[PDB]
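Follow-up to my post from last week.
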Amino acid sequence: MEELMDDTCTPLFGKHKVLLNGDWVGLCADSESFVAELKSRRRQSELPREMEIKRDKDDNE
Amino acid sequence: QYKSRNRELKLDIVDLDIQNTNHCSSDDQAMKDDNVCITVTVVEASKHSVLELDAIRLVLIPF
Amino acid sequence: STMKFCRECNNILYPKEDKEQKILLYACRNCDHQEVADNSCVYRNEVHHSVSERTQILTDVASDPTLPRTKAVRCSKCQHREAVFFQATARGEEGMTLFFVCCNPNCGHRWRE
Amino acid sequence: FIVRLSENEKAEDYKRREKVLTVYFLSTEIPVWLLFFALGVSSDKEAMDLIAFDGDDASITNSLIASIHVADAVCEAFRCGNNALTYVEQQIKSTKFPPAESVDECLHLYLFPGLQSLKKKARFLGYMVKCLLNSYAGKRKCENRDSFRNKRIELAGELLEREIRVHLAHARRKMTRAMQKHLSG
Amino acid sequence: GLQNVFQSFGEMLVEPSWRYATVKFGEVTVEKPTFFSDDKELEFLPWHARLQNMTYSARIKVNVQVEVFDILIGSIPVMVKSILCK
Ligand SMILES: [Zn+2]
Ligand SMILES: [Zn+2]
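User reply:
Got it. Predicted complex:
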């Protein structure tokens, strides 16, 4: 996950947004390789088990 | 309906002629060669008090 | 409805017709700049009457009415009285001719006036 | 932070009667394009690149043009310098119960406290405007209360503390009102 | 849950108009439900509260410090078989 940019002039090319509890915390380039790598940490007791990881392509976030 | 309904707000309009034309010369998007065009022209009383764009866009078009 | 952007100000532009030149110009409100317009198009809109967004499918808006039915006729294949009638045109005719469609679910027959 | 999309009741000359984008922050209705220019944004181009619409509609562009017009009419030269922050300060300070802090610091702990930078909460504001325009254009469904996706239940961790707090607020008011009578001899 | 309640409140300064008052709250310490009888502090069970018609509750004690330039605050009802239960 990449850090959210600071300048208001840099546009988002294809980076999907990351919303942690409704708060924008970062950006991910490829979400299909991000959620699949994040669920493996949840299935190995490296993450909280009561954590919903949703990936929708309609809003790109 | 123009000559029988005064519910439109007054833009100091004395006449409103409508010229039917089957081929208009508006070079914007030539996508329909088998359609007709309707030109609505407002008659002004020798001034520019009607020539604003927002009133024509908001009152004359939905009327 | 068509909006353009300023060259140096990078703000919105407003259409301003020059009465002394009889042309169309786009003038920036913040910076003193009057750009040359193009094709004299200041408004364009595909007319869509969908002014009730996210509410047209709850109540019956009736944007597609039904065809009327009559029972004073009789079909050719089956001996049914109910039939759907409407008005349309043919492939090369000039006018409007009455058509019929049978209401029987096993008939499948249609005929003209 | 409530951002609505309704008709322009304020400064209506009976001709400009289209929809406009206004916000409801700290009981003060300001136009959204003044709040854009008050936080980092210096031009209309980068303010439209933040609200990425990528569509073709006539009710969105006309509403954005009306928002730009109501931002330029309510404040003179708001797109140059820091004239928008004065209007934001005067709109919060004219409320019935304004906060005692300065308005330059009220935009850092009240407007999106989960974000750090003052320019990032403008991008979040543009994202919030983009979601509203996508829901108005029919490309996004509204949130329904019947679904359990937008619903959270509370059994004892929120039902009991919200009754503990309304009694602690009375115990802290029955303490000062009895210590004030035993403080000055 | 109790620390977030007792830590999100800000006590205003008691100024009637020098000599002023300012009170604060510290750490939250909840005890176990006991019975304050005449002999000693006996063990209190949830069926003793059901048969004697009383509340199975535990007392809350917070650190109160008053500065000028373990105090009982209440009792919360206790659910049966909780993190503090007989
Ligand atoms: Zn035409
Ligand atoms: Zn038949």
